């Protein structure tokens, strides 16, 4: 039987494991190992219908030849596990056990892999957990459907920038863009009168939101430039709300009869738009098309980097900004102390009596501390505590180095 | 005639102006100026129905004595300006021109003020813009309604942490908690079968979601502790979806007949739950009750700080993390160079011929530069560049100080 397979597992201690046995069983089988691969992923915030969408992609993948691939209207939606409720469902990364072999309009036979991912910003996950899942799914997929609710907000762009930057760090250097197709899929688009449901309205909507212009503030420009530089092809699809039954009914199990017809109409456009043979983007790494065996080799290698400690840790705004503020303030403070001591006992300055040098040092040290205490920082004195002690500990070291210099110039005259 | 008044203006260059004349005209009037004040605010992501909600608060405020204050089912919703479309409507902060005078059950007559705010994360706003509006509405309000769509995600908690932290920085030091009542208002709650609509289901949902435990990762703990430490009273209300007409219909103008009965039923509970006489939290700053007169003074004082450059700038995850990584790497790299030069030309060391010292310095500088280059940082080499040049420029300054120490020990012997 075909089924979902857990491939990347996120542990309770926030570490990550790759099930290589399971991965090899699927992608290294003789029928597919040497086929060029198309990898489709859906990712984004938790509880927003990723698995559900992905299960409709499955119906299409199996029954694409039929005009009614969308399914019997009384049949439940199965595959990757999905359900209602406010608690996250999908964890780590899972792939469908059956790799699809599809013929492209070029006579080419390709392997199609489907990837479902753990939602970002659930309440048991560190930012590192979420970033790793998102990054890994982006580096591996050739088509990434970035799933969003109702609108494309500035915080959505910021997250994407962060998560994709985390992906870039783990990759070999290239002048080419790191990734290929990105789709901003907007669920519950509420304004068809302004931008139509689907790809055309979506495209117009996205071009307005990702626009970079001369008078746009750099912070706004930069997050946008980052996204443009990452992906070869960027598109947007606006999907209508599927109706409150889909949203609210604890008994709903996916029967098309319970889904609003305008949603079904746009869904039938969306899936082939993603996944028809003419649309299947072959995975390229470093500008080279990759086979299923090669994809397994990049997957192992990338995971290894995220399991290690070479990468910087992803951090929240408060945490990262607090660190930045403190580090910068320690540097100014120390550097102020250091310039001033140079005027007292630099190499071109005379011997100073050690009692007087200690008095000037205490003066100068204190000025640097008061200087540091006085700079406002995220998040206040509490967070600063360990940095202030570092500042003092580091100034004392400089002072010790100055003492040695001063002592090498010592003058003593015997006198009654 | 009562109406909305623009009180805080955000300019196109991202600066802030207070309309004091307008503020004084409203809050310094002889009837209200000396009355203890209750300030109600709504804040959160743009396009989520903040103003719409507030206009229902206005209906309750005018008609609280009637059981049917919610209105005639054909009456359009007016007051603060609201509409559909994906582009933000409300900018800055506006207050209702009419201050409501209400008698509390203890016989006190208090003044009630309403605040509508510019939504966060729109595509024309810097993070500082958003942070400033949210912070200011929180510092001024005694009741802050934190408006969320569908769920409370880890990113929502993070935004709230940052924004409230930005507010604390502008405030006087105190052992008391900086703020009073916070309401997590969840719009379009989809799981009444799990947690009931309203305050009781919200309270249970929020206690699960804001819970701090021993085995929870510090990052999850810290965002929670911060929120507990900021607010005196924290509550949650789960609100049903108002129906797709309200969400989707460009002609909808607020008539209750077009709004789902379950939403209306719950709306009728929510507003008095927020704003009934027994519920009206009198504004306290530093543990002291504030009059309308006093509030205007704090509003002016806080604004000055946000107009200045005393505060740290709010930054995105990538911007702050990139800076932290770079600052930290420059300090290690410089510190490595510095220790090594100490073994060569500290005060306890012999004279070294300047040609040889230069050779040692170049060796050492290069080692520190590689050390810096080898550390992976967000986001890569481009961003690291201004820092690397600073690193080289700062090492050269150190070298210049060492040259002087060394020259002070010079040995020259004349010999044929
Ligand atoms: N409002 C809305 N709800 C949807 C939509 N599609 C699916 N849902 C509902 O979303 C709920 C969760 O779906 P699911 O696919 O499990 O979401 P997920 O993104 O995979 N969740 P997780 O990140 O926890 O795996 C279900 O009750 C489903 O009916 C949509 O377009 N809009
Ligand atoms: N889904 C949903 N839509 C709602 C709800 N309440 C109001 N709306 C719709 O949301 C839209 C925006 O309402 P509005 O009050 O202007 O929102 P806002 O949060 O003040 N927006 P802004 O930040 O741009 O000023 C309107 O079309 C309104 O009908 C709700 O609970 N759920
Ligand atoms: Mg899922
Ligand atoms: Mg508004």
Swiss-Prot record, chains A, B:
User: Which ranges of this chain reside in the Cytoplasmic compartment per its record?
Assistant: 1-416
Q: How does it sit in the membrane?
A: Multi-pass membrane protein
Q: What is the effect of changing residue 187 to Q?
A: In SPG3; loss of GTP-binding; loss of homodimerization; loss of GTPase-dependent fusogenic activity; changed endoplasmic reticulum tubular network membrane organization
Could you tell me where this protein is found in the cell?
Endoplasmic reticulum membrane; Golgi apparatus membrane; Cell projection, Axon
Q: What is the effect of changing residue 368 to Y?
A: Changed endoplasmic reticulum tubular network organization. Alters homodimerization. Endoplasmic reticulum and Golgi morphology are affected
Enzyme Commission number(s) of this protein: 3.6.5.-
Coiled-coil parts of chain: 382-409
Instruction: Relate the outcome reported for changing residue 413 to P.
Output: Changed endoplasmic reticulum tubular network membrane organization
Question: What disease does the Swiss-Prot or TrEMBL record associate with this chain?
Answer: Spastic paraplegia 3, autosomal dominant: A form of spastic paraplegia, a neurodegenerative disorder characterized by a slow, gradual, progressive weakness and spasticity of the lower limbs. Rate of progression and the severity of symptoms are quite variable. Initial symptoms may include difficulty with balance, weakness and stiffness in the legs, muscle spasms, and dragging the toes when walking. In some forms of the disorder, bladder symptoms (such as incontinence) may appear, or the weakness and stiffness may spread to other parts of the body.
Domain comment from the record reads as follows: The N-terminal hypervariable region (HVR) regulates ATL1-mediated membrane tethering by organizing ATL1 into a lattice structure on the same membrane. It does not affect GTP hydrolysis or membrane fusion. It has no effect on the GTP hydrolysis and fusion steps.
Name assigned to this protein: Atlastin-1
Organism of origin: Homo sapiens
**Lineage of this protein's species?**
Eukaryota, Metazoa, Chordata, Craniata, Vertebrata
Q: Which gene encodes it?
A: ATL1
Report the portion of the entire protein shown. Answer: 31 to 446 of 558
